[PDB]
Design a protein around this ligand. Structure first.
Ligand SMILES: Nc1ncnc2c1ncn2[C@@H]1O[C@H](COP(=O)(O)OP(=O)(O)CP(=O)(O)O)[C@@H](O)[C@H]1O
Ligand SMILES: [Mg+2]
Length: 213
């Protein structure tokens, strides 16, 4: 097999944020689940609204749903949506190379005490909450306008993007969190089942919890 892999450097402030998220103790890291579900919901909304003005956008995948997959053997939590998806350029621009002023301000407020980790989503950097519980994050995504791509980072100032040769999504995003050893309790069946219930009260799309044994 062969793949071309492109390597990118994180914007300096995003690199600093990732370092802060990883190298500091946080008591309650539950916000990561809220943020991942929120992104899935937003993506489903986007394709849903696009369909109202152009019905054909749904032809790649008719269902609009979220699947959450804890896998203890693999030490992974996977969240799949059939939302809008991201092109390669979408992933480069949205997941590391561009920072908004929310990043600097969040780090300031974390240090001053004005903000805690649970408010990360108010600063426009909700995605990076994944690194509270994960050593490596892998983002597989398929947008109607591009081939399926896979973004991966274990922080440390770099991410990679490659044409995806794993299972076709049709359309949407599959995010795979490789869980830190001390955060593996997030993969416990009843714990994740109940947290999903807790962080999906206002979600208007079906959620399926698929526990891998
Ligand atoms: N499942 C998904 N499908 C499509 N795009 C996604 C996605 N998850 C993340 N993204 C993209 O990455 C960007 C960054 O996500 P992130 O959650 O950090 O910020 P956000 O724009 O959702 C505001 P917030 O900080 O409130 O969550 C999003 O704006 C979106 O474009
Ligand atoms: Mg978000």
């Amino acid at each position: 097999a062969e793949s071309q892999v492109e390597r990118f450097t994180f914007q300096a402030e995003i690199n600093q944020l990732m370092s802060l998220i990883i190298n500091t103790f946080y008591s309650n890291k539950e916000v990561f689940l809220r943020e991942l579900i929120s992104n899935a919901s937003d993506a489903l909304d986007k394709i849903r609204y696009q369909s109202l003005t152009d019905a054909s956008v749904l032809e790649s995948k008719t269902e609009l749903e979220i699947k959450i997959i804890p896998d203890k053997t693999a030490k992974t939590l996977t969240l799949i949506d059939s939302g809008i998806g991201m092109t390669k350029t979408d992933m480069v621009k949205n997941l590391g190379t561009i920072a908004r002023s929310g990043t600097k301000n969040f780090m300031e407020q974390l240090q001053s005490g004005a903000a805690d980790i649970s408010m990360i989503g108010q600063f426009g950097v909700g995605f990076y909450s994944a690194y509270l519980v994960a050593d490596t994050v892998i983002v597989h995504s398929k947008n109607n306008d591009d081939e399926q791509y896979v973004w991966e980072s274990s922080a440390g100032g770099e991410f990679t993007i490659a044409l995806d040769h794993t299972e076709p999504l049709g359309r949407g995003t599959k995010i795979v969190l490789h869980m830190k050893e001390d955060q593996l309790d997030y993969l416990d069946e009843t714990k994740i089942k109940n947290l999903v219930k807790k962080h999906s009260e206002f979600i208007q799309y079906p959620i399926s919890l698929l526990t891998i044994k």
